[PDB]
Amino acid sequence: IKEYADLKSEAPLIVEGHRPQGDIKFNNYSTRYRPELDLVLKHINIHIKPNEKVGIVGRTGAGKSSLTLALFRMIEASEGNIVIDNIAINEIGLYDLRHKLSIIPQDSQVFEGTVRENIDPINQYTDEAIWRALELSHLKEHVLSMSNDGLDAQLTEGGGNLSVGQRQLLCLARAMLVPSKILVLDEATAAVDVETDKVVQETIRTAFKDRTILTIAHRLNTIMDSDRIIVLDNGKVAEFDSPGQLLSDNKSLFYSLCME
Numbered sequence: 284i285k286e287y288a289d290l291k292s293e294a295p296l297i298v299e300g301h302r303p304q305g306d307i308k309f310n311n312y313s314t315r316y317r318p319e320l321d322l323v324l325k326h327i328n329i330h331i332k333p334n335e336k337v338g339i340v341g342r343t344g345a346g347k348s349s350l351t352l353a354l355f356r357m358i359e360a361s362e363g364n365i366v367i368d369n370i371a372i373n374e375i376g377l378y379d380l381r382h383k384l385s386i387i388p389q390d391s392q393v394f395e396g397t398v399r400e401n402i403d404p405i406n407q408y409t410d411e412a413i414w415r416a417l418e419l420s421h422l423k424e425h426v427l428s429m430s431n432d433g434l435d436a437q438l439t440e441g442g443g444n445l446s447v448g449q450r451q452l453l454c455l456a457r458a459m460l461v462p463s464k465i466l467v468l469d470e471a472t473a474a475v476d477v478e479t480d481k482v483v484q485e486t487i488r489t490a491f492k493d494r495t496i497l498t499i500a501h502r503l504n505t506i507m508d509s510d511r512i513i514v515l516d517n518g519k520v521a522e523f524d525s526p527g528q529l530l531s532d533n534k535s536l537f538y539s540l541c542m543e
Contacts, residue, residue: 298376305465307331312363323349325518337497338509345516385463391454399434416460448476468498503541
């Protein structure tokens with residue numbers, strides 16, 4: 284027990300510096316997936332518009348997954364830094380950093396309890412906010428199917444578990460319930476219900492029409508629908524980021540990926 288009681292913490296949760304829209308600005312940021320591994324991000328300096336919708340693509344093993352971890356400081360930066368809203372990611376403190384942002388993970392999960400608790404464990408949203416978020420996510424209707432408890436209807440890891448593709452919709456519902464200043468997205472590595480995919484893609488853009496959506500894609504269609512796309516490979520941005528100009532003219536690897 285003391286063996287884990289002695290573990291080195293990831294980072295201080297709260298710091299003196301705190302913020303009061305959005306911003307994403309790499310500043311020669313570079314990072315390795317782990318200290319024992321070589322670098323996975325190399326001197327990125329990209330800047331994203333305050334309400335931009337952007338897409339990240341790459342080959343299998345390109346290292347693009349680490350972008351979310353670095354943006355959430357899940358991995359400490361090997362070099363360089365990032366700034367959001369004129370405040371560095373390190374200064375704000377991890378608690379506030381993760382509270383102000385939002386993200387759909389590669390794999391979402393269900394927690395044993397209630398949907399209301401599994402969506403607002405912090406208990407910081409109004410009941411009308413919860414209802415409106417579930418409705419805008421097109422989730423309240425199927426939520427009411429389980430039991431008369433509605434928002435308080437139970438759920439569990441097994442037996443009382445939801446649809447495998449419904450998990451990602453629920454995570455998106457949580458993200459849209461949160462008043463996020465910035466957002467991120469991800470998709471199932473394996474094949475999933477295209478109905479759920481369309482529902483998520485429609486609702487995310489319809490809700491966060493005024494908030495940033497930087498998405499990581501396993502299918503290039505989301506890159507096509509993104510206002511800006513940057514392809515990443517070998518720990519480096521692989522081309523001049525554009526909405527499809529390189530696909531139109533250069534026939535770049537971005538075009539080859541959409542061909543594939």
